[PDB]
Structure 1
């Protein structure tokens, strides 16, 4: 239902958008959120859904809020409030100054040097998975590639057994797109329940995997605590299991639907990195937020201490003020403006790993399976939440149009 309108919010700003089930979802999830950028819609709106909260609807306000951590705090970043309050991942639930000291440690485990360590194996797993599918003439992309490719790279990096994936994937998805069986707090505690013994084991007997590195790490020259390590590792699991996994499906759905765009990349594969950036803009997927630390007037709107404000990345990338014809995918787009990896002091530390997985996937897929389509008659369903995704993506192709490398 709809939470009662707080007295400080005027009626003309009320737009009852539901981030977990947006009314226009059947048009595509990005399209559903873009209803907030129609002609009659102010830059900042109040929804009475999900307990009641603000939504910033334009890149300019989104970027400003991200930059101003004094007024807009990461301490309670997720909607609904109970989820934001429970959320205590590091460094995401912290503001500067305390946040910063934890970035260097996370960078040690998912940053560029690690992407270098994993380079060959990333390449090898993409090729092996795609070659196994190639002669089939069909696949269920979400389960056959989008999930196993990034997830198996992550489990390798984290030194976790692949047999644990179904359990961990289920729990991660309850934090972002809950089925209703578990509250955010329950799902998070279950992920903690998994990590707690593994962290203790690896503090006793360190390995070289990401969990060992975090758990034995130093934070500005002092030892990390067991609790801090757990809160960092929780975030890493969500990053590994529910980010690139969804993004790959949005991208492949688009490419399946656009022979012209496939052809551009088939003919000029050196454009794949630029294509990756334009796809990251167009198929952005995270709805991050903040909590007001004081009463504050922002863009003519009175915000009250404790109000939550959603800062959806879809709305920066799809903002026509920032990107002309924003629903069009243009691989030659000149100035690709987006906040898909965040903005300000919390810029995604996994972004280098993410881009490598995306770029490798596009290159290695189009090399082997240049010509593919959505299964005839299929209707692709999206799902919305803290991270949006694609429920299923049945693809088909003629094996005679494929090439084994």
Structure 2
């Protein structure tokens, strides 16, 4: 066992030295995650083995095949990240068309408009927390409107969602899930009581009524859960980590400002360097198998370090150098394989628009002190707060 809680807050703040320590000793290792989680299992820290692990049919995401149960599954229902083919294939079909880049570009003007408004409000203040004034409100606004639930309670949803994704206590975690399941049941019933609506959630409602076996009521609830929660807690961090990383590497920021053409690739290099999802979600071995010649037992949990893979020097030369010209085409920030992030085109767009607009409208943007508290859970990378001035 390697208890990662033993490295304390240093690891929370900067995990990469430890991932490097481990990657030198091999591609995979049995570990205990830090508190409060304290989860035991195989952690994959090399790129090639991480990548292959992400595409491996021997790793199930569905704990109920082993009689195991979790709060998400029982209270929200089955959603994409906790199902294997063929069920996965069904559910993903329902939504995949909605999230291609071509389709998602239809939202650009609204995204640009939300971005302009938030900037209009923030800029006169001369300084702000980037997170509250900008990075948080943009994603949430966009995903609610695409879902067709524009009028939701942001503040409450964010608090419920905050707990769910980075939990503090086990009772507060349970509390969050019950309340969010109830809130989502209610929002689904609201949509059912209105005239038919041309948005994603409306489309899902209709699909279930046309054929119960294509989509159960449980799965309908759980889809809305995952789209809303991924839809915000995570693009927020990409934007925030983007700004933070640019403003702490002012030569890259200068190079970008000199050629704004470099933006899309800059965003990719942030995905590599400080990817918001640090470790991938739940997998276990469906059968006995091996990762780079280490024996893994049937039922063993496998955690794939996406960000550790991003800093593997075997894949990414000078891995700790943030270089916007690298424009890395092969990072695992969005996963790999059949579960490859559904939202990747949308998240890219949002961050693209946010960063360009923020940069063009704040030419002397600068960090206004150290950033706020990092969430515990080495499942997420980001900061609760980012004070900036301009």
Q: TM-score, normalised by structure 2?
A: 0.87
Q: How does 1:286-301 map to 2 (within 5 A)?
A: 286=277, 287-288=279-280, 289-301=282-294
Tell me by how many angstroms 1:73 deviates.
0.7
Q: Which residue of 1 aligns with 2:123?
A: 134
Q: Which residue of 2 aligns with 1:55?
A: 43
Moved more, 252-261 or 265-274: 252-261
Q: Which has the higher helix share?
A: 2
SS for the counterpart of 1:53 is strand
Out of 214, 225, 229, the residue aligned to residue 220 of structure 2 is 229
Q: Which residue of 2 aligns with 1:316?
A: 309
Q: Which residue of 2 aligns with 1:199?
A: 188
Name stretches of at least 5 consecutive residues in structure 1 with no aligned partner: 1-13, 398-405
Tell me by how many angstroms 1:363 deviates.
1.0
2:169 equivalent to 1:180 = yes
Counterpart CA distance in 1 for 2:313 and 2:69 is 30
8 Å contact from structure 1 (residues 25, 383) kept in 2: no
Out of 62, 65, 87, the residue aligned to residue 75 of structure 1 is 62
8 Å contact from structure 2 (residues 268, 327) kept in 1: no
- Residues 81, 41 of structure 1: alpha-carbon distance in 2 compared, 3 angstrom cutoff: farther
- Residues 22, 207 of structure 1: alpha-carbon distance in 2 compared, 3 angstrom cutoff: farther
- Residues 170, 379 of structure 1: alpha-carbon distance in 2 compared, 3 angstrom cutoff: closer
Aligned-CA RMSD value: 2.7
SS for the counterpart of 2:338 is helix
Counterpart CA distance in 1 for 2:252 and 2:309 is 23
Counterpart CA distance in 2 for 1:320 and 1:338 is 12
SS for the counterpart of 1:120 is helix
2:264 equivalent to 1:273 = yes
Q: Deviations over 1:309-328 (max 9, x none)?
A: 11121012111111011121
Counterpart CA distance in 1 for 2:321 and 2:337 is 27
Count of residue pairs brought into register by the alignment? 376
8 Å contact from structure 2 (residues 265, 328) kept in 1: no
Counterpart CA distance in 2 for 1:265 and 1:350 is 25
Where has structure 1 moved over 4 Å in runs of 4 or more? 80-89, 183-186, 218-223
- Residues 280, 334 of structure 1: alpha-carbon distance in 2 compared, 3 angstrom cutoff: closer
2:179 equivalent to 1:190 = yes
SS for the counterpart of 2:3 is coil
8 Å contact from structure 1 (residues 101, 220) kept in 2: no
Tell me by how many angstroms 1:56 deviates.
0.6
Q: Which residue of 1 aligns with 2:375?
A: 383
Q: Which residue of 2 aligns with 1:6?
A: none
Q: Deviations over 1:75-122 (max 9, x none)?
A: 149xx9856875854211111232112223222444435423311010
Q: Which residue of 2 aligns with 1:106?
A: 95
Out of 199, 213, 227, the residue aligned to residue 203 of structure 2 is 213
- Residues 111, 170 of structure 1: alpha-carbon distance in 2 compared, 3 angstrom cutoff: farther
SS for the counterpart of 2:303 is strand
Out of 334, 346, 368, the residue aligned to residue 339 of structure 2 is 346
Q: Deviations over 1:299-349 (max 9, x none)?
A: 332222221111121012111111011121111116443111110001111
Moved more, 230-239 or 214-223: 214-223
- Residues 194, 364 of structure 1: alpha-carbon distance in 2 compared, 3 angstrom cutoff: same
- Residues 220, 295 of structure 1: alpha-carbon distance in 2 compared, 3 angstrom cutoff: farther
Out of 226, 233, 237, the residue aligned to residue 242 of structure 1 is 233
- Residues 223, 117 of structure 1: alpha-carbon distance in 2 compared, 3 angstrom cutoff: same
- Residues 301, 219 of structure 1: alpha-carbon distance in 2 compared, 3 angstrom cutoff: farther
Counterpart CA distance in 2 for 1:296 and 1:223 is 33
2:319 equivalent to 1:326 = yes
Tell me by how many angstroms 1:240 deviates.
1.5
Q: Which residue of 2 aligns with 1:154?
A: 143
Tell me by how many angstroms 1:218 deviates.
6.1
8 Å contact from structure 2 (residues 163, 172) kept in 1: yes
Counterpart CA distance in 1 for 2:189 and 2:135 is 31
Q: Deviations over 1:273-324 (max 9, x none)?
A: 1111111111112222311112333333222222111112101211111101
8 Å contact from structure 2 (residues 208, 215) kept in 1: yes
Counterpart CA distance in 1 for 2:244 and 2:2 is 30
